[PDB]
RNA sequence: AAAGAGAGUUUGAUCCUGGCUCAGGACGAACGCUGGCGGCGUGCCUAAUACAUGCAAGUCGAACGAACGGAAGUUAGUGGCGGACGGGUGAGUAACACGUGGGCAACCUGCCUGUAAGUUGGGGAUAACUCCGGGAAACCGGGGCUAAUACCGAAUGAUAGAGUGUGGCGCAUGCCACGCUCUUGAAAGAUGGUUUCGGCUAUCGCUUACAGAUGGGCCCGCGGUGCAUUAGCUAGUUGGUAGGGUAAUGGCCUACCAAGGCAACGAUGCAUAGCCGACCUGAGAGGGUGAUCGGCCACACUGGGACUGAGACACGGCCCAGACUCCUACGGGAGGCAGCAGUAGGGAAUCUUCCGCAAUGGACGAAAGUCUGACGGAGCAACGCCGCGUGUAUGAAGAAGGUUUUCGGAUCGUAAAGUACUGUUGUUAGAGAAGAACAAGGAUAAGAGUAACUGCUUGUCCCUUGACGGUAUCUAACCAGAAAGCCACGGCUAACUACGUGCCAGCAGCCGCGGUAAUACGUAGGUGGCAAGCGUUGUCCGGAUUUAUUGGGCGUAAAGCGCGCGCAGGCGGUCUUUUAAGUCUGAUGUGAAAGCCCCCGGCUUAACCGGGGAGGGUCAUUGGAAACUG
C-alpha cells in the first residue's frame, strides 16, 4: 500500500524532513517512489512547500498520508479540494 | 521453534496440510478416470467430464489452485472428449 | 572556459641512450614521542573462526467456551493478520549477476483507491475442558462434552470452458468489441440507531468481476579480467513432430525423428572477483579501488527436500544426513550472534553486556494501546575534517645565567623582571530553549447518504504528550594564573657553531659520511618547518613520454624475421547518378537520490546542512543534410 510520508535528513538534532510518496515496505530512508516537498519544523513558524497537485494525483491512486502529513495538507488546505472532486 | 508465534505456525500448518492433501487427490481421480474412459470411448466419457469440471473449478474457490490452472485444464480435457 | 616545474647518480672531462632514487597528494590504517577543548563524521580490512549471558516479532475480547467483583467493570487457548518487512555479511558467482536500453499479442500480484452485482438457506465436527494410560524429561496415546468470521454440501450468480454469429483490426504465432446456445463456479458475521417485535439502517467486514496504483517473473542488443607454456568442446547436446507441467514462452520435462550446435571476432579449461552510483590521483586522456551512504544480487553451521501462503524452497519456521556442544534414569532428547551489546581466538590493528519509544517509519487493532537493539540519543578511541585556546600593549645599547669569543665582544633577547589590561577557556552561582505535529477525547458548522437517526467526510475552537536533559544557550564575580610538543640543519631541501669519539661507536632515500681540528656519528647552544601534534612503515596515483591514441622508437646505444609464393584481414586512381550504413544536426523519453561543479540561504564563522541548476550515454523512437568513407 503506496502512501506519503517524511523522510528524516539532516544533521543531528537538526532535523528536516523531505516529503516522499513510497511504500510502507522500504526503509525509511530508502527506496522511493517520488518527491514531493519538504517540511522545516524547528523553523517556529514552520514552513511547508507542496506540489499541490501531484499529490491529489497521487490520492486518487490509493495513496494514504500518515498522521502527521495530514495535519500539513489540511493546514495548507488541499483535503478540501480532495473532498469536492471525490464528490463532484 | 523458540517464538511463541511459531509453534502455533508448524502445527496450524500441518492441519491446512492434511485439508488439502485429501481434496487435492480427490481432484486428480476425477483425471484419471477420464482420460482412461476416453480411450475407451465409452458413454461415460461425456458426463465423466462435468464432475471433473466440477472438481476444478471448486479447488480456486476454495484457493489451493490458481484460476489459470484450473481453466487451462477444462480447456486441455475437452481435446480429449473426441 | 581550462591548460603540463624538476633534481641526484655511469666519465679524467663531454654529449646521448637508459635504469634506480627523491621532492606532491590520499588512507576504515598501524607503530614511536607527546597531548587542552568544542562541532560534524568514522571505528574487526584477519578466522563466512567457536560462542557464555541478556534483549532483537508480535497483535486482536468489536470472531468463539474463564479468574477478581451481589453477578457491574479489567487479564490464558481455537481463529485472523503479521513473521517473505525492518537488520547482518561478501563466502560463492566470469553469468542476462550488474549498468544502460527495449519486448511480453507469453505473465502474476495480499494490503491500498474507484465502480457494478449480492451477502440466501443447512450439516457434521474438534481444540479448550474432564477422566484413564505411557515416559526420567521432552512430551505422546485412549474415552466423553462444547462454540465460532473454524470446516463441508445446497439455491442463485461468469467476459471460466465448449460450440458460434457479426463487425473493426494487427507484427507471423494472433488482438479488440458486441450477440446467441450449453455446462461448471460464492459468501460471515460483529458493534450501534430506529421501530414494534415485522423490518429498516450506520460502520468494519465477506464473495465475484473490471479498472488504477504498487511489487515481482521471463526474454533480448550493447558494456566492463589474467593465461595459448589452456585447441578443440558438447549428446538433452542442436532442430522438428505430439504430449506433460508452469502465473506465463521455452528441451523446462518426456516419446519419436534427423545430426546437428559453439569456437582463432578466442569455445573449453585454470586463476582471481559480488556489480554499480561513486572514491583517490591526474593538465587532460587515463591508472588504482569498490570500507562508510544509496540501488540490485547471493548467503544464513555444511549438503538435500518440500509444506503453508498473494508472496519463501523461508536469518531468530519444518523434515533427513554430516561435524561440533550440551542434558540423560542409556530408552532417547536440545541447539545455531555473517541481529544489538559482550566473550575467547587470530592479528600490527579496531568501541558499551547503556537510555527511550518523546520525533520518523514499521506490524496488529475500530481506538486508546501493545511490540520495535529499526530508529532517536548517550558512552569509549587525536581515527579524520573544521574552529581557537596555551595571554595582550608598553617596556635595556641590553638584568642575571647558558653558548661561544684572536677574550674587545656577539647570541638567546624585548624575550626577561617592572607598569597597565583582558577572561575565549577555567572555578563558583544564578536564568533556561527549539525539537510537539499529534492521536484520542468535547463542542460546533457544512456536506453525501437517510422515512428518520446513530454514524461517515471536511472546517474551527478546548484539552493532552520529551530519553536526550537542567543538555545547548546567557550574565555575575576571581584568576595570567592549570594548558607545547615533534622532526630536520653536506646536496637534493628552508635552517650552523662548540665539545666527545677516532673505519670504533655509529648514520643512510640516493650520492655517500666516520682511519686523534666530523656544518653528515652522540650531546649541547642556535636556527628552520609544522603544531595538539609531529615522525616512521605499508598500499595507490603523479613526477615516468618508463607501453608514447593524446605522447616513443628499430645504421653503430635494446629493437627489420635469411628470403620468397601467398588464404583470411587491413588500406586503396579519376568522373556522373542514386542510396543513406558510417558522419553532422533538431524534437521526444530516459540516464534515481546522495556525491564533484555553479548560484542563493541557515547553524555566532567554518566544517556541516537545505533550495534550484548544470554535467554525465559509441542509449531508444522520429525528422532532416549529402561534402567525405561505405
Ligand atoms: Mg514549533
Ligand atoms: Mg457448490
Ligand atoms: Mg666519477
Ligand atoms: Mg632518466
Ligand atoms: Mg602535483
Ligand atoms: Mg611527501
Ligand atoms: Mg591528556
Ligand atoms: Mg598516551
Ligand atoms: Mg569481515
Ligand atoms: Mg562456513
Ligand atoms: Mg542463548
Ligand atoms: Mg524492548
Ligand atoms: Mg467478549
Ligand atoms: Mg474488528
Ligand atoms: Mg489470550
Ligand atoms: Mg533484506
Ligand atoms: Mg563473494
Ligand atoms: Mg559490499
Ligand atoms: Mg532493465
Ligand atoms: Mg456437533
Ligand atoms: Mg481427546
Ligand atoms: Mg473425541
Ligand atoms: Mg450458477
Ligand atoms: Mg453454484
Ligand atoms: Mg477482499
Ligand atoms: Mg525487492
Ligand atoms: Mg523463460
Ligand atoms: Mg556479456
Ligand atoms: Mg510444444
Ligand atoms: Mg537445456
Ligand atoms: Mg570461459
Ligand atoms: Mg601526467
Ligand atoms: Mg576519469
Ligand atoms: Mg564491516
Ligand atoms: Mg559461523
Ligand atoms: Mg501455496
Ligand atoms: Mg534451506
Ligand atoms: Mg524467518
Ligand atoms: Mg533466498
Ligand atoms: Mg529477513
Ligand atoms: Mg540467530
Ligand atoms: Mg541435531
Ligand atoms: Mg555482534
Ligand atoms: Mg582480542
Ligand atoms: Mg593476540
Ligand atoms: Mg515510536
Ligand atoms: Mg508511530
Ligand atoms: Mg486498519
Ligand atoms: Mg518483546
Ligand atoms: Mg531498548
Ligand atoms: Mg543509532
Ligand atoms: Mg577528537
Ligand atoms: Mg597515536
Ligand atoms: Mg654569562
Ligand atoms: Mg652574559
Ligand atoms: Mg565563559
Ligand atoms: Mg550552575
Ligand atoms: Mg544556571
Ligand atoms: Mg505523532
Ligand atoms: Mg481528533
Ligand atoms: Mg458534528
Ligand atoms: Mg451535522
Ligand atoms: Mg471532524
Ligand atoms: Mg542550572
Ligand atoms: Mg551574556
Ligand atoms: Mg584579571
Ligand atoms: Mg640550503
Ligand atoms: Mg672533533
Ligand atoms: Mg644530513
Ligand atoms: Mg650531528
Ligand atoms: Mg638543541
Ligand atoms: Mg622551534
Ligand atoms: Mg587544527
Ligand atoms: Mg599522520
Ligand atoms: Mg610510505
Ligand atoms: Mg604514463
Ligand atoms: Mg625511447
Ligand atoms: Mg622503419
Ligand atoms: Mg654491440
Ligand atoms: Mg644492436
Ligand atoms: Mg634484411
Ligand atoms: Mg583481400
Ligand atoms: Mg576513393
Ligand atoms: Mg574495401
Ligand atoms: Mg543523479
Ligand atoms: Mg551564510
Ligand atoms: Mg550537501
Ligand atoms: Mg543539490
Ligand atoms: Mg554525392
Ligand atoms: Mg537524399
Redesign the pocket.
Known sequence: ??????????????????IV???????????????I??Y?????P?EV?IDEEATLK??????????????????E?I??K??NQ??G | ?????????????????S???S??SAMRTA?KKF?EAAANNADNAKDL???A??????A??????????????????????A
Open positions: 500500500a503506496v502512501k506519503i510520508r517524511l523522510k528524516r535528513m539532516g544533521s543531528k538534532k537538526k532535523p528536516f524532513y523531505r510518496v513510497a511504500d510502507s515496505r522500504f526503509p525509511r530512508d530508502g527506496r522511493s517512489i517520488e518527491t516537498g519538504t522545516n519544523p524547528l523553523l517556529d514552520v512547500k497521487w490520492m486518487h491512486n490509493g495513496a494514504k498520508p500518515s498522521d502527521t502529513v495530514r495535519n500539513l495538507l489540511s493546514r488546505g483535503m478540501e480532495f473532498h471525490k464528490l | 521453534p523458540n517464538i511463541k508465534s511459531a509453534i502455533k505456525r508448524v502445527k496450524t500448518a500441518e492441519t491446512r496440510n485439508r488439502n492433501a481434496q487435492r483425471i482420460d467430464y462435468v464432475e469440471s466440477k472438481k476444478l473449478d471448486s480456486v474457490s476454495k484457493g489451493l489452485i490458481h484460476k489459470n490452472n484450473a481453466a487451462r485444464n477444462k480447456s486441455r480435457l475437452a481435446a480429449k472428449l
